[PDB]
Design a protein around this ligand. Structure first.
Ligand SMILES: CCCCCCCCCCCCCCCCCC(=O)OC[C@H](COP(=O)([O-])OCC(O)COP(=O)([O-])OC[C@@H](COC(=O)CCCCCCCCCCCCCCCCC)OC(=O)CCCCCCCCCCCCCCCCC)OC(=O)CCCCCCCCCCCCCCCCC
Ligand SMILES: CCCCCCCCCCCCCCCCCC(=O)OC[C@H](COP(=O)([O-])OCC(O)COP(=O)([O-])OC[C@@H](COC(=O)CCCCCCCCCCCCCCCCC)OC(=O)CCCCCCCCCCCCCCCCC)OC(=O)CCCCCCCCCCCCCCCCC
Ligand SMILES: CCCCCCCCCCCCCCCCCC(=O)OC[C@H](COP(=O)([O-])OCC(O)COP(=O)([O-])OC[C@@H](COC(=O)CCCCCCCCCCCCCCCCC)OC(=O)CCCCCCCCCCCCCCCCC)OC(=O)CCCCCCCCCCCCCCCCC
Ligand SMILES: CCCCCCCCCCCCCCCCCC(=O)OC[C@H](COP(=O)([O-])OCC[N+](C)(C)C)OC(=O)CCCCCCCCCCCCCCCCC
Ligand SMILES: CCCCCCCCCCCCCCCCCC(=O)OC[C@H](COP(=O)([O-])OCC[N+](C)(C)C)OC(=O)CCCCCCCCCCCCCCCCC
Ligand SMILES: CCCCCCCCCCCCCCCCCC(=O)OC[C@H](COP(=O)([O-])OCC[N+](C)(C)C)OC(=O)CCCCCCCCCCCCCCCCC
Ligand SMILES: CCCCCCCCCCCCCCCCCC(=O)OC[C@H](COP(=O)([O-])OCC[N+](C)(C)C)OC(=O)CCCCCCCCCCCCCCCCC
Ligand SMILES: CCCCCCCCCCCCCCCC(=O)OC[C@H](COP(=O)(O)O)OC(=O)CCCCCCCCCCCCCCC
Ligand code: SF4
Lengths: 133, 59, 73, 67, 142, 62, 64, 59, 161, 58, 121, 283, 102, 93
């Protein structure tokens, strides 16, 4: 449907959740049910289509966001889909997408260490009390 | 990498086992079975119950 | 001319540890450069991605800013 | 002795706030457990079930959304 | 540290050591606190689990209590003829007391920067949550 | 196994100190649990800072 | 602790199957080439459950 | 107990504590392990290199 | 020719079997005490890679250390036959060599060589610990050299045939 | 030591749960889009199957 | 639990054992085995074994296996509650303690009757 | 080429299976070398405890003693007793060797550094141990030596005890980790090693380790004084080498298991600086 | 018991031809309880589509991490009566075993 | 000035070469396992069961789409092999 891979879809959604909020609310209300069992998608098809169209619209990004998007993708590749471990890079990508003009000064006020290649190896650096959940 | 420290610990425990073999005498099968089934099973179950109680207290 | 016994023992310990430590830290010996190249290839590009029409900064401007800031080194 | 101690402590923990009361006396189980346990339980009478958030209306903070 | 920062998984993936960034973030938050020091309403609405006076007293008293306990322990059980083990155990008790006090202080800091999260502006909130001070450029003089 | 006065005094002091040590350990564990409660409260406040919106269930659910 | 005399001993009654050797006892040649044996002891051992019952020592392997 | 198989008229809690120490926390795997493995290994080897050294003899 | 591969492999096999030379835990008389003395630290047998094994199946050397009696000769023969090949036999002590002090007895066999093929003899009564070590080392050297003692003849191309 | 270690393990578990709260929040943020894509694919397959069944059974 | 990789690894291990089989066969070239009367007979410490294949043992400790059969399942029943003890409630805690107490009582009865030791027959 | 490609679809994949086989062979050879080095270490440590040099002349300063002993065991000939069952006498050691060389699959060398993505590591260990005990019992039975059969019975008793002992240990351990995977233990052991909780039962942990490793005081099956050699009284050469290798494999891997589950695995002992450490860092 | 492995000299052919082969034939002919279960390959796998469906809302609402959840929900919540019955049964069985030994 | 080693340390050092050889072999084995499990994935992928339900679904969505969804939606009556050597069901029944 999107021709986009799962982790990239998650990264894009982490920002698109704030642009198509009304469509997301409509879809959620349509799928709401009195039991945990899922509702038939035939009823929510229209809301899903609207949400997907807005997601297509939102997936576009400014070129300045490319470095942040790439580092977030690398983090989400080295970690098998753990959004918490890579939220900082995803947060930077969301910030760049929201008002990208300020991202120029954001990058300008960068330290030498930050201005370095970002390599992720979780086996070498597990972290602190990482539950992987 | 983690396997460096893991190998260090494995070597330590292997040396401990070798020293224990060189030091301690040998048990009898009946003696060890009696000891186990009369004391150690109760010890293990009591330790498990204590752990359950402590976990319940802290949670 | 003589050296302390503990100095000699530390020399032996270093001889054992430095090679083992380096080997442990680099299990993929001589292929770290290949890993870096693969990571660079995985890294996406402006053409690969789709960009907004009302971009605050153009692709050339972003490239110039990255070159000025030395973002990747 | 440990059982008696923990039971006394659990009964004394009523002083603390609701989320920190003893789990012996207060239940905290997954949504799969709670839904089946309190589906038509008039004793609890939690109310309707929030499908996309997996909780009843009367449970504290059932539907918690961003912004 | 045992757990690291509560907002993010510290040293997860890539390990980052940026003392300049740490100093800039600390300076930004210090400037924020100094700027809002005079605001009586803002000071009134600040909350913490344990009082600052209480945590200071605990920090400065726990090591002393540990030292007293160690002194009693060595007096009761240790032979006065020797001193190496007595000094070691007294130091261990003092370090235990210092550990209790430092934990009190660190938990006070954690409560201060967690309960009062909503009072900070958006930029400072983002800077605190993330490891980068670039979200709060204006605060550290740039 | 008759015991002398000094040995009996040492045993009695050991028992007393063991009792005091156990009581202190239990008290410290109680304090640690209280600390855990405080940390949970702090983190709950932090998380709920921005998650303040509650969406009512649609009327069509019933 | 309760009594265990019956579990500990088993007498043999005349022409009785239950009070008799209901098993084929292990007749082992403990030694001479046995690490425990000093080297010249040929002890015919009647084991029943790995418990010695009957001893027949032969000690002439070092008669000189 | 030292003189025969009999037992004291009045047992004391010292025996209880000794039995608990011996059973619950088995000291054999620590006491002997240390005393032999870690300490006795510090002595020079008593071996004599026969091909290049000879043992003491007398005229 | 196979010799190109056989000879180096022969040397490797000889070296391995010399390094790992496990005798049998079998002692009959006072010479067993000397064998234990040779085993213990003062003359560490493990230095030359010889470790005693209880079962004959796991033994390379038959240390006949002590007197052999008529009542035991069938047992010694059975042990020798049951020991897995290849194997060597080392007689230790005068009693094992030629009957020793009891050569004029009515019960002692006049020598273990009458029942077993004795590869080597270690004179003594009791042989010293160093004497037993010397005998074992000489037997090891002979064993290493036994694989190729220059039996096969060299042709014009220096290859054995 | 047993009591203190159990308390420490419980503290670690509760910290893990605290971070799981934020992980669940992020997963909730990312949920609706993937759900919509999956629903669209499922409905496309259902439409294909319905067309095939109608053609075969009509 | 794994996948078909486990079966493929079993096959690979069999091939690795074939490697040792080749080494053992090649070793045959460096020794000769003579035929002797007692070279292929049971070893009984330097003498002929009187009995072979009639090696019945006395199973006078069978109560231990009997109780192991029960206690293995008793312990196995405790795994789900230990795994999901974070979900424990009043009922689950009571049931777990009830089961543990039952196991303890069974062990105590066994000790009282003295069936955990070797017997005459 | 269009009409020829289909013929090679299954022919082009055999090299991949060959590569997998080669990698498995390399891993097995490396673990065999590790076990040989462990044997040499055991000999040297016993020599130190007994105040003797130990292996010193098989290779310069005894550097190739294990190689020499392995080659000698290969060289030694084997003969099956006439009264024994020819098929089983060779079948049992083959299965024992296969199981021992399958042991290494249930090992982790990092957070997810394992040859296979196995979750029930403890279950695998228990099953493999039971299979090895089966093989030892069958060896003792089919070798009609009375000492071998008694060794098999002792092995059965040891297995009976190990069942309950290791089951209770695993029950206590899983109560914290909540999983059978070795990785889940290290995350909880990062701050403090799990052995601190079990400090009271440290003696029982040591007993469990020794019993599972079949070391003293639990060397009943292979008791060399009570029995001639044990279950291998009638086995020589590589048949006995396989049993020795299996015993050392079990020792090494259960040492790894104990280290991972109770001593932090691949986490450094940070508890030595617990007092000076800080539990949080807020800027 | 039966260490040597020698067993009773039994000939199964007589019973196989007298009673078991025809009875088995009749039972196989007249026995089938499977009502309408369909073999794999009965229809193309491409017609089945439910296995691809994923519920991401339930996924993020689910906090389970082990496959013992049904087992605990059965043994300790729903079938706790049978769990206690099994415990009592095992205790009584141990008592009966001890009495049989005596 | 005989700056020789202490007696205990010198005694201990005898067995050190065995430790060094053991470390060499163990590092070789661990690195071989790491490389074998790293090359196919270009990383040390976390175990599937060591992940949340949502993470598992996200990880396997792409594989499901590539292996089942596309053939299912592009299916034709004559695509299936006549030998019945088709892909097995995802949930085998
Ligand atoms: C085409 C490519 C070309 C590439 C470039 C060219 C080639 C480069 C290759 C470089 C590496 C080659 C190996 C060098 C070895 C040097 C040996 C040496 O120093 O000689 C003296 C040393 C003298 O030893 P010795 O005569 O036996 O001992 C005398 C007495 O024992 C008394 O002994 P002592 O008192 O003297 O003390 C003994 C010990 C004293 O040392 C210590 O005390 C410290 C060490 C022990 C640590 C213990 C930790 C655990 C503690 C447990 C508890 C406490 C202990 C006590 C316990 C009991 C207490 C009761 O000292 C040593 O022997 C230290 C030397 C360390 C050598 C190992 C180095 C590498 C190891 C890691 C693997 C590396 C992989 C490759 C990496 C490549 C990239 C860098 O020589 C030896 O005999 C060697 C002993 C060690 C075994 C080495 C095995 C090597 C096998 C070959 C491996 C090939 C693969 C790797 C290379 C691949 C190519 C890159
Ligand atoms: C978070 C969890 C943490 C763990 C939790 C654990 C909880 C367990 C609870 C349950 C158990 C409780 C146990 C309590 C026991 C105490 C009870 C008590 O008070 O009883 C009174 C009872 C009554 O005694 P008393 O009648 O008063 O008589 C006094 C004694 O005569 C004594 O006479 P003295 O005092 O005149 O002489 C003894 C004194 C002797 O002292 C000395 O001689 C000074 C030290 C000399 C060091 C020698 C080695 C130097 C090595 C240098 C290497 C350089 C190499 C350079 C080249 C490198 C090249 C690579 O020994 C010491 O006290 C040494 C203590 C200092 C150790 C070193 C520093 C370690 C610091 C650790 C980190 C601290 C960071 C803070 C945070 C901590 C957080 C946990 O006292 C005793 O029995 C005392 C026993 C003392 C034993 C000392 C043993 C030291 C360790 C020996 C190691 C040997 C290894 C050899 C090599 C091995 C190779 C494989
Ligand atoms: C004499 C006359 C001439 C005869 C000619 C004979 C025929 C010649 C060949 C003719 C045909 C040539 C065809 C060429 C074109 C086609 C090539 C092709 O299809 O491949 C492309 C194919 C796919 O292409 P690609 O994606 O571009 O590849 C990029 C990399 O895959 C990307 O790598 P990555 O970033 O993904 O990183 C992971 C990579 C990186 O991993 C590595 O391979 C790097 C190195 C890892 C650690 C190595 C440590 C080894 C030492 C450990 C300690 C041993 C101690 C005990 C032994 C004693 C040692 C003294 O690992 C792997 O891919 C997994 C492979 C695991 C290899 C297994 C371990 C190797 C050592 C075997 C040891 C055997 C036991 C000891 C034997 C003792 C004998 C005395 O690439 C591969 O799969 C490469 C496989 C390489 C295997 C390892 C090669 C050896 C490396 C150097 C070490 C040599 C040690 C020798 C020891 C000797 C001692 C005496
Ligand atoms: C691998 C085996 C290792 C075994 C090592 C054995 C070495 C020999 C013994 C050395 C003992 C050294 C003394 C300190 C030992 C650690 C004590 C401990 O657990 O405290 C950590 C604890 C740390 O707990 P904490 O984690 O709550 O610390 C504060 C936490 N924050 C930061 C969140 C506030 O220290 C204290 O807090 C002080 C004591 C509090 C009261 C309860 C303590 C219960 C356990 C006491 C055990 C005492 C045993 C020794 C008795 C005296 C012997 C002289
Ligand atoms: C040349 C003559 C050949 C004669 C025929 C060969 C006979 C071979 C007999 C043994 C192998 C049988 C293979 C077929 C069964 C595969 C079952 C299966 O699905 O497993 C994978 C399954 C994989 O399932 P999955 O969960 O990955 O799901 C697959 C998903 N789809 C359908 C989409 C592909 O295994 C598991 O699920 C769990 C792992 C099991 C690991 C078992 C390890 C122990 C195996 C011991 C076998 C011993 C055999 C030899 C000795 C005994 C006598 C036979
Ligand atoms: C991935 C890494 C792989 C590494 C593999 C490394 C393993 C190497 C294994 C080498 C094995 C060598 C075997 C030698 C056998 C001949 C000698 C012998 O046994 O002697 C006794 C007997 C001969 O005994 P004899 O009667 O001559 O007596 C010799 C004694 N003297 C000298 C005193 C007379 O062997 C024979 O019968 C010889 C003739 C027949 C065999 C001829 C050679 C066949 C080779 C087959 C190779 C098969 C390869 C398979 C590969 C695929 C495997 C999956
Ligand atoms: C899996 C392997 C085992 C793991 C076990 C878990 C770790 C436990 C660590 C030790 C904690 C203390 C336990 C109690 C010790 C009691 C000793 C005792 O009885 O003292 C009095 C004993 C003797 O006193 P006694 O009174 O008991 O007996 C003597 C009797 N009279 C008085 C008549 C003479 O004194 C000693 O010598 C004690 C020395 C203790 C030293 C222990 C060292 C152990 C080292 C190895 C431990 C394992 C390390 C693993 C490292 C892994 C790293 C990755
Ligand atoms: C699981 C392994 C680790 C151990 C964990 C459990 C520890 C349990 C003991 C904690 C300390 C108890 C202090 C009691 C002080 C006291 O009253 O002390 C009173 C007297 C004092 O005796 P003295 O006058 O000789 O000092 O002691 C006693 O009465 C001894 C009581 C028994 C203690 C044995 C050890 C504990 C065994 C398990 C508990 C069951 C005991 C049953 C006894 C009949
Ligand atoms: S030769 Fe001498 S030492 Fe040896 S057994 Fe005969 S009498 Fe004893």
């Amino acid at each position: 449907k999107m021709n986009t891979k799962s982790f990239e879809v998650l990264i894009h959604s982490q920002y698109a959740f704030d642009v198509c909020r009304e469509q997301v609310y409509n879809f959620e209300d349509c799928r709401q049910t009195d039991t945990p069992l899922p509702k038939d998608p035939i009823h929510c098809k229209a809301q899903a289509k609207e949400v997907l169209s807005c997601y297509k619209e939102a997936e576009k990004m400014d070129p300045i966001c490319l470095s942040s998007f790439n580092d977030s993708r690398e983090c989400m590749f080295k970690s098998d889909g753990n959004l918490y471990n890579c939220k900082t890079w995803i947060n930077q990508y969301v910030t760049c997408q929201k008002n990208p003009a300020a991202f120029a000064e954001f990058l300008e006020a960068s330290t030498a260490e930050q201005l370095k290649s970002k390599k992720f190896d979780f086996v070498k650096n597990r972290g602190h009390s990482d539950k992987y959940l | 990498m983690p396997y460096f420290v893991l190998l260090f610990k494995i070597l330590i425990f292997c040396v401990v086992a070798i020293a224990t073999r060189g030091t301690l005498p040998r048990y009898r099968f009946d003696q060890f079975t009696q000891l186990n089934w009369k004391h150690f099973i109760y010890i293990w179950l009591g330790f498990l119950v204590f752990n359950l109680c402590f976990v319940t207290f802290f949670i | 001319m003589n050296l302390p016994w503990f100095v000699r023992w530390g020399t032996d310990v270093a001889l054992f540890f430095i090679p083992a430590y380096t080997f442990a830290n680099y299990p993929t010996t001589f292929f770290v450069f290949a890993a870096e190249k693969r990571r660079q290839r995985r890294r996406k590009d402006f053409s690969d991605v789709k960009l907004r029409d009302d971009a605050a900064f153009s692709v050339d401007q972003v490239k110039q800013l990255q070159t000025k800031l030395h973002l990747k080194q | 002795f440990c059982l008696l101690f923990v039971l006394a402590d659990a009964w004394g923990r009523e002083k603390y706030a609701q989320p920190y009361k003893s789990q012996i006396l207060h239940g905290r189980q997954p949504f799969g457990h709670t839904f089946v346990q309190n589906y038509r339980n008039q004793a609890t009478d939690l109310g309707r079930w929030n499908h996309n958030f997996a909780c009843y209306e009367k449970q504290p903070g059932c539907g918690r959304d961003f912004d | 540290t045992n757990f690291g920062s509560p907002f993010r998984n510290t040293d997860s993936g890539i390990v980052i050591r940026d003392p300049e960034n740490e100093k800039r973030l600390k300076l930004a938050f210090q400037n924020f606190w100094k700027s809002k020091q005079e605001d009586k309403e803002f000071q009134a609405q600040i909350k913490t689990a344990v009082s600052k006076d209480t945590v200071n007293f605990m920090f400065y008293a726990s090591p002393l209590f540990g030292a007293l306990l160690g002194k009693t322990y060595i007096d009761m059980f240790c032979n006065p003829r020797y001193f190496y083990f007595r000094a070691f155990t007294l130091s261990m008790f003092a370090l235990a007391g210092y550990c209790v006090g430092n934990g009190f202080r660190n938990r006070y800091e954690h409560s201060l920067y967690t309960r009062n999260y909503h009072l900070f502006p958006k930029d400072l909130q983002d800077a605190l949550v993330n490891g980068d001070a670039r979200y709060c450029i204006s605060w550290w003089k740039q | 196994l008759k015991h002398s006065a000094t040995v009996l005094r040492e045993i009695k002091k050991d028992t007393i100190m063991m009792i005091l040590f156990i009581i202190g350990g239990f008290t410290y564990c109680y304090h640690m649990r209280e600390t855990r409660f405080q940390l949970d409260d702090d983190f709950n406040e932090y998380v709920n800072t921005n998650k303040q919106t509650f969406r009512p269930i649609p009327d069509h659910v019933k | 602790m309760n009594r265990s005399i019956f579990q500990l001993w088993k007498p043999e009654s005349p022409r009785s199957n239950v009070n008799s050797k209901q098993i084929k006892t292990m007749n082992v040649n403990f030694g001479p080439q046995h690490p425990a044996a000093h080297g010249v002891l040929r002890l015919i051992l009647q084991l029943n459950g790995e418990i010695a019952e009957r001893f027949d020592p032969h000690i002439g392997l070092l008669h000189r | 107990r030292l003189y025969g198989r009999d037992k004291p008229d009045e047992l004391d809690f010292t025996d209880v504590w000794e039995s608990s120490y011996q059973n619950i926390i088995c000291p054999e795997y620590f006491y002997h392990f240390w005393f032999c493995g870690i300490v006795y290994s510090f002595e020079p080897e008593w071996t004599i290199n026969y091909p290049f050294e000879k043992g003491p003899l007398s005229p | 020719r196979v010799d190109y591969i056989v000879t180096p492999i022969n040397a490797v096999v000889s070296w391995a079997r010399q390094g790992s030379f496990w005798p049998l835990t079998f002692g009959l008389a006072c010479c067993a005490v000397e064998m234990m003395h040779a085993t213990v630290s003062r003359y560490d047998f493990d230095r030359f890679g010889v470790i005693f094994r209880a079962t004959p199946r796991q033994a390379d050397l038959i240390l006949v250390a002590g007197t052999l009696t008529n009542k035991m000769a069938p047992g010694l023969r059975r042990l020798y036959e049951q020991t897995l090949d290849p194997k060597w036999v080392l007689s230790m002590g005068s009693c094992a060599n030629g009957g020793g002090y009891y050569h004029y007895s009515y019960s002692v066999v006049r020598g273990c060589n009458r029942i077993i093929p004795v590869d080597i003899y270690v004179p003594g009564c009791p042989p010293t610990a160093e004497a037993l070590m010397f005998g074992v080392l000489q037997l090891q050297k002979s064993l290493y050299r036994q694989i190729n003692e220059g039996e096969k003849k060299y042709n014009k191309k220096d290859l054995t045939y | 030591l047993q009591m203190w270690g159990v308390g420490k393990i419980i503290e670690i578990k509760k910290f893990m749960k605290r971070r799981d709260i934020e992980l669940k929040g992020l997963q909730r943020k990312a949920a609706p889009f993937m759900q919509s894509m999956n629903d669209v694919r499922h409905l496309a397959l259902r439409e294909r199957n319905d067309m095939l069944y109608n053609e075969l059974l009509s | 639990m794994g996948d078909a990789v486990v079966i493929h690894l079993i096959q690979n291990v069999l091939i690795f054992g074939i490697i040792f089989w080749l080494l053992t066969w090649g070793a045959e070239y460096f020794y000769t085995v003579k035929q002797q009367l007692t070279k292929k007979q049971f070893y009984e410490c330097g003498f002929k074994s009187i009995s072979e294949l009639n090696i019945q043992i006395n199973f006078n400790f069978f109560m231990l296996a009997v109780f192991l059969i029960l206690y293995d399942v008793e312990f196995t029943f405790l795994f789900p509650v230990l795994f999901n003890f974070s979900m424990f409630s009043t009922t689950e805690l009571f049931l777990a303690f009830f089961f543990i107490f039952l196991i303890l009582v069974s062990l105590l009865y066994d000790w009282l009757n003295n069936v955990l030791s070797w017997s005459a027959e | 080429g269009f009409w020829i490609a289909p013929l090679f679809v299954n022919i082009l994949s055999l090299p991949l299976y060959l590569v997998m086989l080669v990698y498995n062979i390399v891993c097995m050879l490396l673990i065999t070398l590790v076990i040989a080095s462990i044997t040499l270490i055991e000999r040297k440590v016993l020599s130190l405890v007994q105040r003797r040099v130990g292996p010193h002349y098989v290779g310069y300063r005894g550097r190739l003693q294990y190689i020499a002993d392995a080659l000698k065991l290969f060289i030694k000939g084997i003969v099956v007793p006439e009264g024994s069952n020819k098929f089983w006498f060779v079948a049992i050691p083959s299965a024992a060797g296969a199981i021992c060389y399958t042991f290494w699959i249930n090992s982790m060398w990092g957070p997810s550094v394992s040859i296979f993505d196995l979750e029930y590591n403890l279950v695998y260990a228990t099953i493999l141990s039971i299979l090895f005990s089966f093989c030892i019992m069958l060896t003792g039975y089919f070798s009609k030596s009375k000492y071998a059969f008694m060794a098999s019975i002792r092995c059965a008793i040891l297995m009976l005890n190990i069942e309950i002992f290791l089951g209770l240990l695993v029950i206590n351990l899983i109560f914290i980790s909540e999983s059978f995977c070795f990785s889940v233990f290290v995350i909880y052991q990062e701050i403090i090693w799990l052995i601190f909780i079990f400090f009271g039962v440290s003696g029982l942990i040591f007993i469990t380790f020794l019993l599972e490793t079949n070391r003293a005081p639990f060397d009943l099956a292979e008791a060399e004084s009570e029995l001639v050699t044990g279950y291998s009284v009638e086995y020589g050469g590589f048949y006995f080498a396989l049993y020795y290798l299996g015993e050392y494999f079990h020792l090494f891997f259960f040492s790894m298991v104990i280290s991972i589950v109770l001593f932090g695995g691949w986490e450094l002992p940070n508890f030595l600086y617990l007092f000076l450490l800080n539990d949080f860092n807020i800027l | 018991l039966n260490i040597d492995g020698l067993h009773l000299k039994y000939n199964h052919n007589i019973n196989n031809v007298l009673y078991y082969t025809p009875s088995l034939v009749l039972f196989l002919i007249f026995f089938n309880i499977d009502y309408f279960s369909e073999l794999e390959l009965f229809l193309p796998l491409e017609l089945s589509f439910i296995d691809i469906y994923d519920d991401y809302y339930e996924g993020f609402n689910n906090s389970i991490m082990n496959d013992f959840t049904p087992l605990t929900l059965s043994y300790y919540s729903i079938n706790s009566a049978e769990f206690i019955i099994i415990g009592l049964l095992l205790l009584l069985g141990s008592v009966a075993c001890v009495n049989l030994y005596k | 000035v005989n700056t020789a080693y202490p007696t205990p340390l010198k005694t201990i050092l005898k067995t050190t070469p065995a430790f060094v050889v053991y470390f060499v072999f163990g590092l070789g084995f661990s690195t071989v396992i790491y490389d074998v499990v790293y090359h196919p994935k270009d990383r040390i992928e976390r175990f599937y069961f060591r992940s949340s339900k949502f993470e598992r679904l996200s990880r396997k969505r792409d594989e499901k789409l590539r292996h089942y969804f596309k053939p299912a939606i592009e299916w034709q009556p004559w695509y299936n092999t006549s030998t019945n050597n088709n892909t097995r069901p995802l949930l085998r029944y």
